[PDB]
Each structure stands twice: as C-alpha cells, then as structure tokens.
Amino acid sequence: APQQINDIVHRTITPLIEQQKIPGMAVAVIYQGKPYYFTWGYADIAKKQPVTQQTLFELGSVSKTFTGVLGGDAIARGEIKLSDPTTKYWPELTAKQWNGITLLHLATYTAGGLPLQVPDEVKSSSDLLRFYQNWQPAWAPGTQRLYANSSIGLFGALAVKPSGLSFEQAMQTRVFQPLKLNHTWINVPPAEEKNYAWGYREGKAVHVSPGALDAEAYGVKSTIEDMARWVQSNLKPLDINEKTLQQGIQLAQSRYWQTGDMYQGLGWEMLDWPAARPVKAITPPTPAVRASWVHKTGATGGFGSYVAFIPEKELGIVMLANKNYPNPARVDAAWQILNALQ
C-alpha cells in the first residue's frame, strides 16, 4: 500500500488498540476506489487465532445499512412505498396509535418513540404483534427521532413481505450475492466458524445472543474484505449492474430528516462534507449528496464497528474490532485517517 496510507493508519490505530485494550482489529481504507487492508491482534485469544482478512466480526448496528439498502431495493422493485401505512403490510396492527405511522417513520426512527430494544420476552410472531399493539407513542409520528432497533427492525420485516422471501433469503439473494459479499452472513454457517472471531466483554469471550428482529437490526457478521466491498458499492452505486440495487443504494443515502448537523437516511446517517431529538422533515427528501460524510457506528456486547465514506472523494474506511469501545474514539481515528488522505 502507498506509504502515506500505511503510515497514517498504523500511527493512528496502534495507539488506539493500546489505549482501548482491543484484542483484535481489522481496518480497510478505500483510497481512490481501491481497498487496502490492515489487521492486528487476535480473533480468538485462548486459541491464539490471529485476525485476518477472512475473520468474521459482528457488525452490530452497522447491519442497519444493509436493511436500509434492502428496503430501498424493494422500493425500486415497486414492492413497497415509504409513504405506505404500516398496516398495509401488517393488517393485524389495528391499535389506533398506528394510524398515520408509515414505513418511512419506522425506517428513520421517527414513529413516535418506539423502544431501543425489543423486550427479551418477545419470541413468537404473536408475542411481537402484542408488543407493537400495546406500545404507546409519546409523540406524534414524524416529530422526534429516537434511535431504535424495534423501529428499523420492523421496517425490515415488513419491507420483505411482498417478496414472500424470509428476511435472510431476501438479503442473500438481493444484496449479498449481487455484490459478491460471499463472506457476509446473518447466520454464520458451520463452515465459517473457524473464522468467526470471539467478542470480548470484561475479558469474557462472547457472541451476540439471538433475539426478535435481530437479523434486521444488528445481526450481520462480515469480513473486512466484504465490508470494503460494501463501502465501494455505496461510494459508487452507478457501477452496480442490478438496476434496483443501484437505486436502493441511492435511496438509502437520501436525506429524509435533519437533526442539528446530521441527516437521517435509511440506515446510513450523513453530514455535509467537510437521546430524543426533534427533527425537521426534508420535503421532499434530498437525493444522495456526494459531498457528504456518510457513516454508521455499530456494536454488540463484544464488538465495535464503524464505517464512514465520502462519495465526492472516492474515500472510505471500515473499522472492525472484537471489543465494544467508545464511539468517539472510533470516529476520532476515522477522521484522522480520512482527513489525512482527504
């Protein structure tokens, strides 16, 4: 790799790994459309397995960018519309609070305060229906943003109903395969277990536990190579052959709401380049802006991830670690690296 990239990355990440006591890490920098990989440490401390370009990390909430793009693809296929009421896809949602709550609200966390997590008690299909029927919003839809897994998670489950495919099957078929993300999974197959890093929480090895709507909100596991590919796809959707996927990617980066300096897309969040929050509606949504800092932070009990890219510079970065460490430290490192190469 160019010495400039090699230098800025190592000088930035080595100290980071030291200060945060991160067991293992993988980083990919996309510079002018080409990826450069870097790895440090262990994927498995006890078995002394090193982190490699083939190691699988839990992406946590970064998984929402996939859900957002799959949703955008379904819109491009004409299978759903973001302006559609939630009940059009789940007739059983008869409780009055759902009137006026659309797929856009679910996808962008503006439904009126859906909770961050789906309760652990919710297992079956009926348990989930009950959870949403009994939920009482604190606000009218489209007025406040409250980041939530139960919100985008529902959007994901409903967005694939018309296709008749399960969520995982729709993701594999419409997103993973076409983009050649052959090492990205919702459920890690026994064949890939040798590459599945352990997460570490308080020194204990851990893997994300199963939960309702986990696939849609925080369940994708991927390698640094596939994530770099995911970033290249999102940097240049126009280079994607599948028409609906190309549009779906563009749709996920459109600006639907503004809260301060941040704009909410579908999964992705953006800021111009270079916690209940009231939001201003962008009417109509602004189509993906090239001069943006597009990003998403993610975590699980044992992992921490970050993705950020700047379309107009053909520049991007992906950071995957098997320790959930402070978001500001992630963003700080990412900014040092991209600013330097910017």
Side-chain angles (χ1 to χ4, degrees), residues 1-17 20 22-33 35-95 97-120 122 124-203 205-240 244-342:
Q3 192 170 36
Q4 197 190 189
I5 295 175
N6 174 267
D7 286 350
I8 189 67
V9 173
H10 284 290
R11 294 197 201 314
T12 296
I13 308 296
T14 293
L16 175 67
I17 290 170
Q20 307 293 168
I22 292 163
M25 186 157 184
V27 174
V29 174
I30 290 64
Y31 178 87
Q32 290 188 59
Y36 297 97
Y37 312 100
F38 309 85
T39 68
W40 300 259
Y42 297 82
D44 185 329
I45 293 170
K47 293 184 185 179
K48 302 168 183 174
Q49 302 304 304
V51 168
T52 62
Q53 295 176 193
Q54 287 67 52
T55 295
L56 286 170
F57 291 83
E58 288 168 6
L59 302 177
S61 291
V62 166
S63 302
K64 295 178 175 59
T65 64
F66 284 100
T67 296
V69 168
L70 177 66
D73 176 78
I75 293 171
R77 284 166 184 278
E79 299 184 320
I80 65 174
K81 294 194 300 294
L82 284 172
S83 52
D84 280 348
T86 299
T87 52
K88 181 165 178 296
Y89 303 99
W90 205 3
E92 294 70 17
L93 261 184
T94 54
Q97 67 269 30
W98 288 93
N99 295 309
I101 292 179
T102 70
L103 292 183
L104 174 65
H105 298 309
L106 295 185
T108 57
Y109 321 116
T110 53
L114 278 165
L116 178 59
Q117 308 120 305
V118 172
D120 240 278
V122 179
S124 65
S125 282
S126 57
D127 295 353
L128 198 67
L129 173 59
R130 195 180 307 135
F131 167 66
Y132 286 110
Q133 279 285 74
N134 292 157
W135 162 74
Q136 290 308 304
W139 325 301
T143 62
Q144 221 152 324
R145 171 184 188 287
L146 186 65
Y147 186 78
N149 291 341
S150 79
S151 185
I152 186 137
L154 183 56
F155 170 75
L158 301 185
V160 300
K161 278 181 174 178
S163 79
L165 303 169
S166 66
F167 184 76
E168 172 176 26
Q169 260 296 311
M171 188 64 81
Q172 285 293 336
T173 299
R174 306 180 168 186
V175 177
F176 297 173
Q177 278 158 44
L179 295 185
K180 289 170 168 60
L181 308 178
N182 310 309
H183 296 286
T184 299
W185 316 90
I186 293 295
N187 301 99
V188 176
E192 312 283 28
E193 290 203 62
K194 55 167 164 55
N195 283 156
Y196 192 11
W198 277 100
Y200 292 86
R201 191 189 207 180
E202 268 129 61
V206 299
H207 276 152
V208 66
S209 291
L213 303 184
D214 56 5
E216 302 78 347
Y218 55 84
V220 179
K221 293 81 187 182
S222 187
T223 65
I224 197 62
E225 286 189 32
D226 275 10
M227 289 305 301
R229 201 164 175 71
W230 178 231
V231 176
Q232 306 181 92
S233 299
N234 281 270
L235 272 170
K236 295 195 64 188
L238 297 183
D239 283 349
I240 296 176
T244 58
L245 185 51
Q246 184 181 80
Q247 298 174 56
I249 285 173
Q250 280 163 145
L251 284 181
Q253 283 175 54
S254 291
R255 298 170 177 197
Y256 299 99
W257 309 90
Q258 168 171 25
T259 177
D261 296 322
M262 174 262 262
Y263 299 90
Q264 184 68 59
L266 307 179
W268 295 111
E269 294 154 16
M270 296 77 57
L271 294 92
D272 284 309
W273 169 265
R277 293 287 173 67
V279 289
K280 180 184 178 180
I282 299 171
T283 304
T286 306
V289 184
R290 308 191 79 258
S292 303
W293 167 280
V294 187
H295 70 153
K296 184 97 247 300
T297 62
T300 56
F303 296 78
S305 63
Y306 188 65
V307 177
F309 59 86
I310 307 171
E312 77 161 4
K313 296 301 179 60
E314 326 184 319
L315 184 55
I317 189 172
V318 179
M319 301 164 57
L320 308 183
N322 61 346
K323 181 177 163 58
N324 179 3
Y325 63 104
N327 281 325
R330 306 175 195 185
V331 172
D332 240 309
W335 158 270
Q336 282 302 328
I337 290 162
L338 299 191
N339 180 220
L341 303 174
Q342 163 266 304

